[PDB]
Amino acid sequence: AQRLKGKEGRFRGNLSGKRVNFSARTVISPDPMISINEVGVPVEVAMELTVPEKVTEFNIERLRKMVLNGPDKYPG
Amino acid sequence: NMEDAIIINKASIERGLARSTFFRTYEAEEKKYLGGQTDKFEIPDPTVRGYRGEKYYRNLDEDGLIFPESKVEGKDVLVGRTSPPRFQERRETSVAVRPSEKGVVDKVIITETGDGTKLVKVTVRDLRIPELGDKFASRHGQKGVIGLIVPQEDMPWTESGIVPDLIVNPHGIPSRMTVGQLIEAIGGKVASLKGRRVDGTAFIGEPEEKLRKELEELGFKHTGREIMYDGITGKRLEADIFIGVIYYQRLHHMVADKIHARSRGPVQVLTKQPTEGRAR
Amino acid sequence: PPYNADFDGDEMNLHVPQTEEAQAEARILMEVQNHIISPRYGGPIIGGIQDHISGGYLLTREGAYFTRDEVEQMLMFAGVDITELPEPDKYDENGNPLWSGKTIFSLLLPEDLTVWYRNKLCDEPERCEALEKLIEEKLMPDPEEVRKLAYD
Amino acid sequence: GIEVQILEKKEDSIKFVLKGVHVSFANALRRTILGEVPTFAVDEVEFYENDSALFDEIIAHRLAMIPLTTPVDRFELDALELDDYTVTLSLEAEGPGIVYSGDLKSDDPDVKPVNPNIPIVKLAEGQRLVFNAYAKLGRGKDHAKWQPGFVYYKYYTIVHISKSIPEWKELKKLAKKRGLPVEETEEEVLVTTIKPFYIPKDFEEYEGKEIWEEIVPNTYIFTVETNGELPVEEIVSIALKILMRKADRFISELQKLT
Amino acid sequence: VEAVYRCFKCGREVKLDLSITRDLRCPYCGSKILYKPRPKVPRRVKAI
Amino acid sequence: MFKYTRFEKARIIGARALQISMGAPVLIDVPPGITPLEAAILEFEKGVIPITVIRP
Amino acid sequence: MKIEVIKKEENLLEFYLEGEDHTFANLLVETLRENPHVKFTAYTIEHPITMARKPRFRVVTDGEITPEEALEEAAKKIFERAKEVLEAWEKAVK
Amino acid sequence: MIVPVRCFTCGKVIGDKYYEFKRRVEAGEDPEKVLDDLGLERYCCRRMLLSHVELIDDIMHYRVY
Ligand SMILES: [Mg+2]
Ligand SMILES: [Zn+2]
Ligand SMILES: [Zn+2]
């Protein structure tokens, strides 16, 4: 009975909300030189978070080059 | 420096301003399980289960303890320890640096605990130069994070040859109503020019008018303002600027300890959702 | 103002969508420029704060004038793709051109925009009344008369 | 035309007046002196023993902060690419006492600590400290340890103090007390702002109408001081030669476009 | 594995094995706390 | 069409991007190095759309 | 120092100058502004962190001279002025 | 811990002048005249000598080997 109910119970806090993958958190500092629809991301976060991309005809070259860059250079 | 952010000089930082060090002590114990099976300190051979990469145990002496003044960078083993397989193998239960941290080993202590077994404590120190996101605060409640680090030649300079160490935004003074900060700014420069410290007691301290008169007597404007020249253009600003000496403190909320990222990671048992906490 | 955030130690979370449909939804529905108008009162929310307003006042205040180098430098810094400076407004001593702040600001506005209102700095209602009479008499009064009866 | 007049020459500083150049040139000279003029400074330290109360990363910083003399004839300090010549500084200390900068030994006689009375660390009884510091040429823009001093300038202005003010005698006395030159004339006293001159609170009312300040065009009062790494005249000449070299390199690269 | 361990209190050069030792003590002052001294290898630290 | 609401445009672009990623050919020449999603936006802006929307 | 032409057409030239900062950029621009045939000229640093060493320039002339010739004139004037100041300083200091 | 080698703001070497200043001001001399005599003129330098506290002496007792 107590397992289901409560803020930390099953019904709420476990299906309603949960920990998620592909996320980061850090402090914020101002920067007026970027557009209002842009966010400055640390290079360290970019190396960790990833976006799966399917290899098609028009992006084979870029993806091949970035695979060649490996996981230690930035555009990799 | 908008919205309670501050601008800090780069040359001043490179000369030893607000530079700090961070210590953290790790601890390992040679537990003595019932029945005679006990842990031991050693270099884990590749045979054992849970044996991580060979590069992780790269600066441990043959007794299983790390060398002082060696460089660790995260997930590196500090004390090599193998546990009995009892939940022909040997579980690996080494104590390693936190995954996101880094530093240098400072001291290693070998003790005999209360129960008679062994106990080892290792402390790793890390240098923390100020950077973007580090939090600073004054005694009058003004808080902020470093917004930008500026080269010295780009900083303005007063007509008497003073280059500011730190720049704050004029919009933070009203609606915060901290005239004490301005009084302290006047008093700091008065004290530095006069060669004696200034009493600032709660109700019997030196009155403001005396400080302004003394500042006037030393060749500066009573208002505390000065004439500066712009760093880039090289010509003087239209308005004279307020400048003084204020006591600032570096807080322990530093960005190197708050950044956190998660791509895949491990999961819990019951819910199989991602774990909670930066450490894991 | 949307996030209600200040740079005094606040922390924020970043999420990276992984599927193409999620990326398309984030790109089309939740772009920042799509949420300039607030859905609570129908007015703008993403606007200037603090130094933007104060510097705007300093730039377009009465009596503000800027030299050639300042005009070119600020126009390049803003990013405006201008190619030739407008005709100088006032010639100061030593024969140097000067440009009023209003011209520099107007270089940033669309070509066909007409609006008039009273801002917070109004303190002499008589000047605003006279200006309103001039505008209301004919909807396009001659610019020189309006410059004659200008008032912050 | 261009001319230079020198007001005061101390041992480690010089204050001269530059006349006939635009503000941009003066700012360029100041920034070039601050950031482009190269000097020698410690870069890496190889510790063998360190039993002092201070960490390795603190003694390394203190060693970096020490100013080292720089020869002028041996190297071409005005070039746009710097030499990689390396000078080794060694030290061995033990026992109670204070380790001073004068105890450092150098491979090259031309490069050595300027001030032999800078304390480095306080060694207690039994504590030892041995290392081998490495110094190399570097520019002030990369790190502040390479800065060859400190430079600033100001406008050359004259303050007009009309004699209609009832108490101009007090203003003249204050100006002479400060040390600025005073040139008395009928109906107005002329004060040359060699050093900043802020008028007191009582006379603040007369500012503008009676006390008004004029700016002599294209004239600046420079102040250059050094920590002993280089003579001041060498610093100024090196900065000017660096500017000439940069102009020539820009000419070459621009011509490469045609 | 024989190794050198400085004492915590008197700072004496105590050398003894630890894997086989059952009772750990400094043979001079009886202290149960020892240090592991820094090695004699050259460490290189950037003077930044 | 008559008028595309925000949700319909987002849905169409997402479906086209998914189809392009899974192997469908692109009916508009595109610059090299573009992601499938931005190819979908370029295709929508050109006006060639092969997906229609059903209204009640 | 490197020159990367952003765009060149008619009497307009826009280019990056890799390896430089305000120190030489401001001096070059202020020397250029003295030329009567230069209608517009300015420089900017796009970002204080990422583009700290990559100022971006813009030069527009009236067609009497090409921009790459006005730049040559400005650089030659800068060199001559620096040489004159150096000679004056050498004479004065000793 | 110990006196800084250079002034944080302008960079003038003031590391060697702390002990002389302390002795002179303790003897009874006016601190302002002592600071003027040492050559420190801008108040950024004077602040570093005035507000410095010597803490290397009372942390030297605890040794770590
Ligand atoms: Mg907050
Ligand atoms: Zn002992
Ligand atoms: Zn100073």
XYZ file of N, CA, C and O in Angstrom, chain B residues 39-135:
388
model
N 40.102 -9.543 3.370
C 40.602 -8.816 2.218
C 42.117 -8.658 2.317
O 42.742 -8.979 3.331
N 42.713 -8.152 1.241
C 44.146 -7.910 1.235
C 44.458 -6.810 0.233
O 43.716 -6.600 -0.728
N 45.560 -6.109 0.477
C 46.012 -5.042 -0.403
C 47.063 -5.597 -1.355
O 48.098 -6.106 -0.914
N 46.799 -5.494 -2.653
C 47.711 -6.021 -3.657
C 47.375 -5.390 -4.998
O 46.369 -4.695 -5.147
N 48.236 -5.646 -5.977
C 47.951 -5.287 -7.362
C 47.057 -6.375 -7.938
O 47.491 -7.529 -8.056
N 45.816 -6.067 -8.307
C 44.926 -7.110 -8.829
C 45.417 -7.630 -10.172
O 45.575 -6.871 -11.129
N 45.664 -8.936 -10.230
C 46.043 -9.575 -11.477
C 44.842 -9.632 -12.418
O 43.695 -9.524 -11.981
N 45.079 -9.796 -13.723
C 43.949 -9.842 -14.667
C 42.996 -11.002 -14.430
O 41.902 -11.010 -15.007
N 43.376 -11.981 -13.608
C 42.517 -13.136 -13.372
C 41.226 -12.745 -12.660
O 40.153 -13.269 -12.983
N 41.307 -11.828 -11.692
C 40.171 -11.571 -10.816
C 38.986 -11.022 -11.603
O 39.141 -10.359 -12.636
N 37.787 -11.315 -11.110
C 36.568 -10.794 -11.708
C 36.380 -9.336 -11.310
O 36.660 -8.948 -10.173
N 35.907 -8.529 -12.256
C 35.805 -7.102 -12.045
C 37.084 -6.338 -12.290
O 37.113 -5.122 -12.062
N 38.139 -7.009 -12.745
C 39.418 -6.374 -13.031
C 39.261 -5.331 -14.126
O 38.993 -5.673 -15.281
N 39.424 -4.059 -13.776
C 39.280 -2.979 -14.742
C 40.551 -2.887 -15.584
O 41.414 -3.767 -15.548
N 40.677 -1.811 -16.357
C 41.781 -1.712 -17.293
C 43.127 -1.689 -16.594
O 43.248 -1.292 -15.434
N 44.152 -2.137 -17.321
C 45.501 -2.164 -16.767
C 46.013 -0.760 -16.477
O 46.768 -0.560 -15.518
N 45.610 0.221 -17.284
C 46.074 1.588 -17.091
C 45.586 2.196 -15.783
O 46.163 3.186 -15.326
N 44.544 1.630 -15.170
C 44.012 2.218 -13.947
C 44.951 1.998 -12.766
O 45.189 2.921 -11.981
N 45.494 0.792 -12.620
C 46.563 0.544 -11.653
C 47.885 0.715 -12.390
O 48.466 -0.245 -12.894
N 48.362 1.956 -12.452
C 49.625 2.258 -13.100
C 50.630 2.951 -12.196
O 51.819 2.970 -12.531
N 50.200 3.498 -11.060
C 51.101 4.175 -10.136
C 50.925 3.663 -8.712
O 51.016 4.434 -7.755
N 50.668 2.368 -8.553
C 50.605 1.755 -7.235
C 51.876 0.970 -6.956
O 52.381 0.252 -7.824
N 52.390 1.108 -5.739
C 53.530 0.314 -5.321
C 53.088 -1.124 -5.052
O 51.898 -1.430 -4.962
N 54.072 -2.017 -4.926
C 53.781 -3.443 -4.826
C 52.982 -3.799 -3.580
O 52.403 -4.889 -3.524
N 52.933 -2.920 -2.581
C 52.120 -3.193 -1.404
C 50.651 -2.861 -1.617
O 49.841 -3.115 -0.721
N 50.290 -2.303 -2.768
C 48.912 -1.989 -3.068
C 48.478 -0.576 -2.755
O 47.273 -0.302 -2.778
N 49.410 0.325 -2.468
C 49.095 1.703 -2.125
C 49.691 2.643 -3.162
O 50.746 2.362 -3.736
N 49.007 3.762 -3.399
C 49.442 4.701 -4.421
C 50.654 5.487 -3.930
O 50.857 5.680 -2.724
N 51.478 5.925 -4.871
C 52.637 6.748 -4.552
C 52.204 8.188 -4.306
O 51.466 8.752 -5.118
N 52.639 8.811 -3.213
C 52.330 10.227 -3.004
C 52.941 11.091 -4.096
O 53.958 10.742 -4.699
N 52.289 12.225 -4.356
C 52.700 13.167 -5.397
C 52.657 12.538 -6.785
O 53.476 12.856 -7.649
N 51.706 11.638 -7.006
C 51.427 11.119 -8.333
C 50.132 11.727 -8.865
O 49.291 12.220 -8.112
N 49.973 11.683 -10.183
C 48.879 12.365 -10.859
C 47.758 11.380 -11.158
O 47.978 10.368 -11.830
N 46.561 11.682 -10.666
C 45.368 10.896 -10.949
C 44.387 11.783 -11.700
O 44.387 13.008 -11.547
N 43.550 11.158 -12.530
C 42.681 11.905 -13.429
C 41.250 11.383 -13.467
O 40.477 11.803 -14.335
N 40.871 10.493 -12.559
C 39.485 10.038 -12.606
C 39.431 8.557 -12.924
O 40.076 8.065 -13.848
N 38.650 7.835 -12.125
C 38.494 6.385 -12.206
C 39.803 5.639 -11.993
O 39.873 4.434 -12.258
N 40.843 6.318 -11.519
C 42.125 5.684 -11.253
C 42.112 5.063 -9.866
O 41.597 5.651 -8.913
N 42.685 3.866 -9.758
C 42.668 3.142 -8.495
C 43.667 3.770 -7.535
O 44.830 4.005 -7.886
N 43.213 4.051 -6.315
C 44.067 4.569 -5.255
C 44.580 3.480 -4.327
O 45.760 3.484 -3.967
N 43.719 2.548 -3.928
C 44.099 1.423 -3.085
C 43.590 0.158 -3.758
O 42.382 0.010 -3.977
N 44.503 -0.754 -4.089
C 44.107 -2.017 -4.687
C 43.735 -3.017 -3.613
O 44.524 -3.291 -2.703
N 42.529 -3.570 -3.716
C 42.017 -4.461 -2.685
C 41.111 -5.502 -3.321
O 40.214 -5.154 -4.093
N 41.345 -6.768 -2.990
C 40.557 -7.878 -3.502
C 39.808 -8.544 -2.359
O 40.391 -8.843 -1.313
N 38.518 -8.783 -2.569
C 37.647 -9.355 -1.561
C 37.423 -10.842 -1.820
O 37.554 -11.306 -2.957
N 37.102 -11.616 -0.784
C 36.842 -13.036 -0.993
C 35.641 -13.233 -1.894
O 34.708 -12.409 -1.907
N 35.621 -14.319 -2.673
C 34.498 -14.545 -3.596
C 33.179 -14.816 -2.900
O 32.134 -14.749 -3.559
N 33.192 -15.130 -1.606
C 31.957 -15.386 -0.877
C 31.060 -14.155 -0.911
O 31.430 -13.088 -0.413
N 29.883 -14.307 -1.508
C 28.960 -13.195 -1.680
C 28.169 -12.931 -0.405
O 28.673 -12.313 0.531
N 36.670 -19.958 -6.244
C 38.024 -20.024 -6.780
C 38.419 -18.701 -7.423
O 39.455 -18.603 -8.079
N 37.589 -17.683 -7.230
C 37.811 -16.359 -7.790
C 38.087 -15.369 -6.663
O 38.159 -15.733 -5.488
N 38.244 -14.104 -7.038
C 38.472 -13.033 -6.074
C 37.812 -11.773 -6.610
O 38.195 -11.285 -7.677
N 36.821 -11.258 -5.889
C 36.173 -10.024 -6.307
C 37.134 -8.852 -6.184
O 37.917 -8.767 -5.235
N 37.070 -7.941 -7.150
C 37.862 -6.721 -7.111
C 37.053 -5.638 -6.409
O 35.942 -5.310 -6.838
N 37.606 -5.089 -5.333
C 36.941 -4.072 -4.525
C 37.891 -2.923 -4.235
O 38.029 -2.463 -3.101
N 38.574 -2.449 -5.271
C 39.503 -1.346 -5.103
C 38.749 -0.044 -4.857
O 37.562 0.090 -5.163
N 39.459 0.924 -4.290
C 38.923 2.256 -4.042
C 39.553 3.201 -5.051
O 40.780 3.348 -5.095
N 38.721 3.849 -5.858
C 39.191 4.670 -6.958
C 38.674 6.095 -6.822
O 37.735 6.372 -6.071
N 39.315 7.001 -7.565
C 38.904 8.396 -7.564
C 37.495 8.513 -8.134
O 37.048 7.676 -8.927
N 36.784 9.556 -7.717
C 35.459 9.805 -8.252
C 35.552 10.043 -9.757
O 36.533 10.614 -10.242
N 34.551 9.603 -10.521
C 34.702 9.573 -11.985
C 34.985 10.925 -12.614
O 35.700 10.987 -13.621
N 34.451 12.010 -12.061
C 34.565 13.322 -12.679
C 35.653 14.194 -12.069
O 35.815 15.340 -12.500
N 36.401 13.697 -11.092
C 37.377 14.514 -10.391
C 38.788 14.238 -10.904
O 39.008 13.424 -11.804
N 39.754 14.930 -10.309
C 41.121 14.979 -10.806
C 41.975 15.666 -9.751
O 41.472 16.466 -8.959
N 43.260 15.345 -9.740
C 44.150 16.020 -8.808
C 45.468 15.277 -8.664
O 45.883 14.545 -9.562
N 46.111 15.501 -7.520
C 47.395 14.899 -7.187
C 47.306 14.326 -5.780
O 46.705 14.936 -4.890
N 47.901 13.150 -5.580
C 47.890 12.515 -4.269
C 48.776 13.306 -3.317
O 49.938 13.598 -3.625
N 48.234 13.648 -2.149
C 48.926 14.496 -1.187
C 49.600 13.705 -0.073
O 50.790 13.901 0.188
N 48.867 12.819 0.597
C 49.442 12.026 1.671
C 48.719 10.692 1.762
O 47.542 10.580 1.411
N 49.442 9.680 2.232
C 48.906 8.342 2.444
C 49.219 7.929 3.874
O 50.377 7.987 4.299
N 48.194 7.508 4.609
C 48.318 7.170 6.020
C 47.942 5.708 6.201
O 46.916 5.259 5.679
N 48.768 4.970 6.938
C 48.519 3.567 7.245
C 48.301 3.453 8.745
O 49.195 3.779 9.535
N 47.119 2.987 9.140
C 46.753 2.900 10.544
C 46.194 1.521 10.855
O 45.828 0.755 9.962
N 46.134 1.220 12.147
C 45.483 0.025 12.665
C 44.191 0.458 13.343
O 44.227 1.192 14.335
N 43.059 0.005 12.814
C 41.772 0.466 13.306
C 41.485 -0.127 14.684
O 42.297 -0.846 15.270
N 40.299 0.190 15.209
C 39.930 -0.277 16.532
C 39.793 -1.782 16.628
O 40.090 -2.369 17.672
N 39.342 -2.427 15.553
C 39.133 -3.867 15.571
C 40.416 -4.663 15.376
O 40.395 -5.885 15.544
N 41.522 -4.011 15.033
C 42.780 -4.688 14.792
C 43.131 -4.858 13.334
O 44.261 -5.263 13.031
N 42.211 -4.566 12.421
C 42.496 -4.662 11.001
C 43.200 -3.394 10.523
O 43.495 -2.482 11.300
N 43.473 -3.334 9.228
C 44.187 -2.210 8.647
C 43.218 -1.156 8.130
O 42.073 -1.451 7.781
N 43.696 0.083 8.081
C 42.902 1.202 7.596
C 43.833 2.178 6.899
O 44.868 2.552 7.455
N 43.467 2.584 5.686
C 44.297 3.448 4.858
C 43.463 4.640 4.417
O 42.328 4.472 3.958
N 44.020 5.839 4.557
C 43.360 7.070 4.148
C 44.259 7.825 3.182
O 45.443 8.030 3.465
N 43.695 8.237 2.051
C 44.426 8.938 1.003
C 43.684 10.225 0.678
O 42.457 10.223 0.536
N 44.425 11.325 0.566
C 43.857 12.625 0.234
C 44.417 13.094 -1.100
O 45.625 13.006 -1.334
N 43.541 13.598 -1.962
C 43.915 14.076 -3.288
C 43.615 15.565 -3.352
O 42.473 15.983 -3.123
N 44.630 16.362 -3.667
C 44.481 17.805 -3.774
C 44.380 18.216 -5.236
O 45.014 17.624 -6.112
N 43.572 19.240 -5.491
C 43.332 19.713 -6.848
C 43.422 21.229 -6.879
O 42.836 21.905 -6.030
N 44.155 21.756 -7.855
C 44.252 23.196 -8.043
C 43.018 23.714 -8.766
O 42.551 23.108 -9.733
N 42.488 24.843 -8.295
C 41.259 25.422 -8.840
C 41.489 26.898 -9.143
O 41.218 27.762 -8.307
N 41.983 27.183 -10.339
C 42.085 28.573 -10.801
C 40.688 29.097 -11.103
O 39.845 28.330 -11.602
N 40.380 30.359 -10.810
C 39.048 30.880 -11.136
C 38.756 30.788 -12.626
O 39.636 30.984 -13.466
N 37.502 30.482 -12.944
C 37.062 30.339 -14.323
C 35.612 30.791 -14.412
O 35.009 31.201 -13.419
N 35.057 30.725 -15.620
C 33.659 31.082 -15.818
C 32.760 30.193 -14.971
O 32.919 28.971 -14.947
N 31.812 30.813 -14.274
C 30.855 30.106 -13.460
C 31.183 30.059 -11.982
O 30.288 29.789 -11.174
N 32.434 30.308 -11.606
C 32.796 30.322 -10.196
C 32.099 31.473 -9.485
O 32.014 32.586 -10.008
N 31.608 31.204 -8.281
C 30.747 32.131 -7.562
C 31.563 32.969 -6.589
O 32.342 32.429 -5.798
